[PDB]
Amino acid sequence: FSGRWXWPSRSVGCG
Amino acid sequence: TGSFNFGIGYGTESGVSFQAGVQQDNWLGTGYAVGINGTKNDYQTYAELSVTNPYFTVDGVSLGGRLFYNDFQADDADLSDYTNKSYGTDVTLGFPINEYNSLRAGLGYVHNSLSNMQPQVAMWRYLYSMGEHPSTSDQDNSFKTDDFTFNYGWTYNKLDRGYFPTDGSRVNLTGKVTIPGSDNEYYKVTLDTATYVPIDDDHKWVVLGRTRWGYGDGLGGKEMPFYENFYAGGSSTVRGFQSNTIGPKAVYFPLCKSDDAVGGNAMAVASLEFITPTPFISANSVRTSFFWDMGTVWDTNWDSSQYSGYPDYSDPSNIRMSAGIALQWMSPLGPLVFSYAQPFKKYDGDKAEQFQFNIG
Amino acid sequence: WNWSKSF
Ligand SMILES: CCCC[P+](CCCC)(CCCC)CCCC
Ligand SMILES: CCCC[P+](CCCC)(CCCC)CCCC
């Protein structure tokens, strides 16, 4: 969820 | 005007996953969509408050701002134990380039709180590179960092359709680099590609090629923090292997081998998949496929000379491989993916997990 | 599964 467009990933499994 | 949501999923890697959110588009007439969202699974909890204007300019340049928190428990993600509680804020700008390409650039602040670290070589080597020297005989420790980063991304999407694509490509490139003033000093880049090539006229026989590349490293004598490591293994990378199992394993301090994955600063995943028509009754709701998955995770700073009695974790050539069958279906409980795969190339300490599934 | 209700 945290790394969805247009955000950088902040959670493991979201890169 | 607004909306709210709650979701429940289930998968082999995440266990039961929960999701909840409240969104108010055009909150107070500001032109900004305000969202409060949270996720929780077996190893991680995430929450954010976002403020977003998809039309920051009348041409579609978007602006996003958020406050976030993340709690990650590494033993629950089948890694060597540590707790990483983080919080921060991100500001991001999205730029439409054309129909298929968008760019993004942003600035981020994150505070990381590391604790419950079971002393191990790679982790302790990173800590030593930061000027930190915690005890190697106990898990009673604390390590805090504050990082300022420049973030960027590129998304390419020319798929014929979003659900069950048959033709075209999806490319996602992400990057980040710390800004002077951060405790950490590193960069990290990711590239994901998916390409669907239809064989027949009716697009019922499709070839999917997928790649995943990850590389990060420290600038100066500092290393990339282990809590930014890449992982491989599981339903979304190399099927037939337990989540995050591929790559380096922890070497604990009493010199102590193990099968607990730690991740690494370099990763490469590749996959060839043949989507075929679903056998038995027929047809647009089921996707059957046969795959060949491969992947490797390594530690470029692993000192093999100092630890010659251990496997060389800086070696990228330990390519894991698996073969199997997958089934996708839009079920009344959400999207469903089931796979049965067999690791036909594994290395010491790798954990196998033949049947894998995800719901939602 | 995901349930979503507007207001
Ligand atoms: C409340 C509606 C959103 C206002 P702004 C959203 C910024 C996101 C990065 C508009 C800034 C324009 C220059 C800033 C608000 C400050 C507290
Ligand atoms: C770094 C992007 C590589 C894309 P591929 C290149 C094919 C040659 C033109 C290889 C994917 C893994 C096997 C696309 C495969 C499509 C079926």
Chains interfacing with A (3 or more CB pairs < 8 Å): B
CB environment B262-298: b (16+ within 10 A), e (fewer): bbbbbbbbbbebebeebeeeeeeebbbbebbbbbbbb
**Residue B63 beta carbon below 6 angstroms from any ligand 1 atom:** yes
- Give all strands (DSSP E) within chain B, no chain letters: 2-11, 15-24, 33-40, 44-53, 62-73, 83-96, 101-115, 142-157, 168-178, 186-198, 206-218, 240-241, 266-276, 286-298, 320-331, 334-345, 352-353, 355-359
> Is there a domain that residue B86 lies in?
no
Single-letter amino acid code for the residue at B338: F
> Is there a domain that residue B73 lies in?
no
Cα B139 to its chain centre, rounded Å, is 26
Contact B241, B234 (CB under 8 A): yes
Give a three-class secondary structure readout of A1-15: CCCCCCCCCCCCCCC
Contact B17, B9 (CB under 8 A): yes
Q: Say how far apart CA A10 and CA B57 lie, in whole Å.
A: 27
Q: How far is A3 from chain B (nearest CA, A)?
A: 10
Q: Which chain B residues touch A12 with a CB distance below 8 Å?
A: 43-44, 72, 77, 231
Q: Say how far apart CA B312 and CA B235 lie, in whole Å.
A: 26
Of all protein residues, the one whose alpha carbon is nearest to atom 1 of ligand 2 is B211
Contact assignment for B5 to C4 by CB distance below 8 Å: yes
Ligand nearest to the CA of B291: 2
Hey, how many other C-beta atoms are within 10 angstroms of the C-beta on B306?
10
In degrees rounded to 5, what are phi and psi of residue B228?
-105, 10
In degrees rounded to 5, what are phi and psi of residue B235?
-50, -35
Query: Which of B109, B134, B42 has the alpha carbon at shortest distance from B79?
Result: B42
User: From its phi and psi, is residue B29 left (phi > 0), alpha (psi between -120 and 50) or beta?
Assistant: left
Q: Say how far apart CA B36 and CA B66 lie, in whole Å.
A: 10
Residues B121, B319, B270, B172, Cα dihedral to 10°: 20
Measured between alpha carbons, how far is residue B271 from residues B232, B275, B341 in Å?
A: 13, 13, 13
Say how many domains are in chain B. Answer: 1
- Partner-chain residue, chosen from B46, B174, B176, that has the shortest CB–CB distance to A1: B46
Measured between alpha carbons, how far is residue B7 from residues B39, B247, B328, B360 in Å?
A: 9, 33, 19, 8
Ligand nearest to the CA of B196: 2
> Is there a domain that residue B254 lies in?
yes
Query: Which of B187, B333, B205, B213 has the alpha carbon at shortest distance from B270?
Result: B213
Contact assignment for A11 to B46 by CB distance below 8 Å: yes
Q: Say how far apart CA B114 and CA B126 lie, in whole Å.
A: 13
Q: Structure resolution in Å?
A: 2.1
Measured between alpha carbons, how far is residue B141 from residues B113, B117, B132, B133, B258 in Å?
A: 11, 7, 11, 10, 21
Q: What tokens were used for B102?
A: 């968008």
* Size of chain B, expressed as the number of residues it contains: 360
Hey, how many other C-beta atoms are within 10 angstroms of the C-beta on B204?
15
What CATH number is given to the structural domain containing B101?
Answer: 2.40.160.50
Q: How far is B172 from chain C (nearest CA, A)?
A: 26
Q: Is the dihedral of CA B259, B265, B266, B269 positive or negative?
A: positive
In degrees rounded to 5, what are phi and psi of residue B257?
-60, 160
Single-letter amino acid code for the residue at B36: I
Q: Say how far apart CA B245 and CA B297 lie, in whole Å.
A: 9
Chains A, B: CB pairs < 8 Å: 62
Query: Which of B321, B337, B333, B241 has the alpha carbon at shortest distance from B289?
Result: B337
Ligand 2 mean position, distance from CA B209 (Å): 5
Measured between alpha carbons, how far is residue B79 from residues B22, B64, B112, B162 in Å?
A: 33, 33, 18, 33
> Is there a domain that residue B42 lies in?
no
Q: Say how far apart CA B123 and CA B196 lie, in whole Å.
A: 39
Q: Say how far apart CA B188 and CA B149 lie, in whole Å.
A: 11
Contact B320, B350 (CB under 8 A): yes
Chains B and C touch (3+ CB pairs under 8 A): yes
Ligand 2 mean position, distance from CA B106 (Å): 30
Q: Say how far apart CA B37 and CA B50 lie, in whole Å.
A: 8
Q: Say how far apart CA B217 and CA B123 lie, in whole Å.
A: 14
> Is there a domain that residue B328 lies in?
yes
> Is there a domain that residue B128 lies in?
yes
Q: Say how far apart CA B326 and CA B356 lie, in whole Å.
A: 9
Ranges of H-type helices in chain B = 121-129
Q: Which chain A residues touch B46 with a CB distance below 8 Å?
A: 1-2, 10-11
Contact assignment for A11 to B70 by CB distance below 8 Å: yes
In degrees rounded to 5, what are phi and psi of residue B158?
-125, 45
Contact B12, B233 (CB under 8 A): no
> Is there a domain that residue B13 lies in?
no
Three-state SS at B161? coil
Q: What is the span of the domain harbouring residue B322?
A: 52-63+92-359
Q: Which helix (H) or strand (E) holds C2?
A: strand C2-6
Q: Which residues contact B133 (CB under 8 A, 6 or more apart)?
A: B127
Ligand 1 mean position, distance from CA B173 (Å): 27
Q: Say how far apart CA B277 and CA B292 lie, in whole Å.
A: 18
**Residue B31 beta carbon below 6 angstroms from any ligand 1 atom:** no
> Is there a domain that residue B306 lies in?
yes
Cα Rg of chain A, angstroms: 6
Of all protein residues, the one whose alpha carbon is nearest to atom 3 of ligand 1 is B32
Query: Which of B275, B259, B253, B360 has the alpha carbon at shortest distance from B325?
Result: B275
Q: What tokens were used for A6?
A: 């247009």
Q: Say how far apart CA B188 and CA B264 lie, in whole Å.
A: 12
The technique is: X-ray
